[PDB]
Symmetry: C3
Subunit: 257 residues, 3 copies
């Protein structure tokens, strides 16, 4: 049987008909699970939480717990996870807080490796990779295709841009623009994720435009406001450069330099 | 029933009124648990260990294990935990060693977040916050109201002062005086935790006196002895400054600079 | 010995004397050797061979597939030797066909809580990996090495015999035998004299190693020049030859 008899399935939980649940796993009240999702053994799921289709959740994960953050006071808040995600061993994923939008959100086709932490009110897009013990403190936005190497630490409210990359052990206290590569503690900008871009099939023209955009922001002594003005032209020509420019414009904690 | 039948409760364990134990948890021999304490599912408690009242311990925590530091364990050694603490997912807390204190001690109103590690013979006071994956290597003393941010690493024997703060990813190798903020690997002193003082309702005069005290110790080229002598007058006027002065006086192995 | 609340696959193979705690899973094609104690809440997946007198603590996942995207379902293995202690929440992944299809651990190793041993890593004997040490993949750790808490090791790095990392080190290049490294990024500081004394090295060998460190690190030599300068001492002291050989095998540079 797909649902192990040693699992605890709350009567309010809603499981699509071919969901699998391993032994000694807990599917709490107000947890909804979509078709084809496999829950391993020793998993704790707490609601209100919606999990989509064809996910996989490994042992010793805690998905949908309250944040311990002292600003949370027992309010009805949610977690939403999309489709085709892989959540590895011991991952912790907390629900949102009413102070923000009362929801933690994860998109599709993400890979969240062992002992990663996804703090309250974080928003992960699609196709992201969080390597072992990556920790998102709270309110962290990770845009599509971003890769955070092992033991990357991300401060509350930070944004991590699309197709960006952090080296192992990075401690990110300011925003990481789209396509930027960062390393170290504190995290330093070291150019763009050109290898990731080439692998994903970005055009040579867009890569060239992005190389120039990086110079405008980082290498010409401009203030952020002067850089944004100087980027307007290239951003109007290349969507990739608009994604870069928009990531700089939405930065609330300054940008990683 | 408050005690789940799928839990294993040793016959020598002692459980007070309103104790709850979740499924697949182990309450070992010589574990005592005080009133109102909630043990989650998948928790391992090992003794001899005394846990006080109204605590909460989350899934996948191992509380009371022997340290792996010594290859041949001593017995008996103890772990004492006070009241109103919250110990989150996957936290490890080791008992003391026969050489040293023979006890690991945690006070009241602490918040120990996911995957934190409290090594053998450590002593935590009251109202502390250890953020995710904070690791106290052994024999570490953390005084009241200290905050250690995510993935703070503390070397053996170090003392963390009252109301101090470490930034995320700090690696602390020397004592942190009361109120002092430290960052980085290796950790360096930056300023004081003025926000914490204001939260505690310190007077503007005490805060001003603490700002001056930081300069006396860090910024005027005094030896520690001289600084202690220069602080005597302010320390006699302000109990808050006495706390600072005392933390410097007790630092026999140097202070974080 | 085998708790009735454990799940033992019919294709698993347990020696006599093996203990398995409640709510542990011993998966298909897992073999376990005599005297090995599996705690409660342990997940073992195969094909995996575990030797004798090991102890594996709760919440460990031993023998899972790597989530690394290059691993595509292939039959890969994991081999663990004897007298190892694997503490709470340790994750150990099997190998990938791209390398040698095997993750390998030797004997008498102490792998502390939440350490991670990535695919195709090779650990020798008598090593200590302190809490949350992470070996990313294809990492070789030679005998008696000590990695302090939260030491991160990049793919393909080699960690020399008797070497020591300080807490929080991020290691991106090879660490020569005996060398002590600290920081992110990791930097060489000195030698692990304590480890030499633990092995009973003679005062002459220790003096020769102190001199060898200066040849490599403190006389402005290139690696090639240093290797040439070490040849004489290495021929005289096997302990120095271990150091020299660790430098010679470092094709991607040494930690400085």
């Amino acid at each position: 049987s797909l649902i192990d008899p040693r699992a605890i399935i709350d009567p309010s939980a809603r499981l699509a008909a071919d969901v699998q649940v391993g032994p000694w796993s807990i599917v709490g009240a107000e947890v909804e699970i979509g078709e084809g999702t496999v829950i391993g053994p020793h998993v704790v799921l707490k609601g209100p939480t919606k999990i989509g289709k064809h996910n996989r959740i490994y042992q010793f994960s805690s998905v949908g717990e309250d944040t311990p953050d002292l600003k949370y006071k027992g309010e009805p808040t949610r977690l939403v996870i999309g489709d085709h995600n892989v959540i590895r061993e011991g991952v912790t994923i907390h629900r949102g807080t009413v102070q923000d939008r009362a929801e933690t959100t994860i998109g599709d086709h993400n890979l969240i490796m062992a002992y990663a932490h996804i703090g309250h009110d974080s928003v992960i897009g699609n196709h992201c990779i969080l390597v072992n013990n990556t920790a998102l403190a709270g309110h962290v936005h990770v845009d599509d295709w971003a890769i955070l190497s092992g033991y990357t630490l991300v401060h509350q409210y930070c944004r991590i841009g699309a197709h960006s990359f952090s080296g192992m052990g990075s401690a990110i206290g300011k925003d990481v623009p789209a396509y930027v590569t960062v390393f170290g503690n504190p995290a330093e900008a070291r150019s763009m994720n050109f290898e990731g871009m080439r692998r994903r099939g970005f055009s040579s023209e867009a890569i060239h435009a992005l190389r120039r955009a990086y110079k405008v922001v980082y290498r010409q002594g401009h203030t952020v406001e002067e850089a944004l003005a100087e980027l307007a032209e290239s951003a109007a020509q290349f969507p990739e450069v608009a994604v870069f420019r928009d990531s700089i414009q939405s930065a609330t904690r300054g940008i990683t330099r």
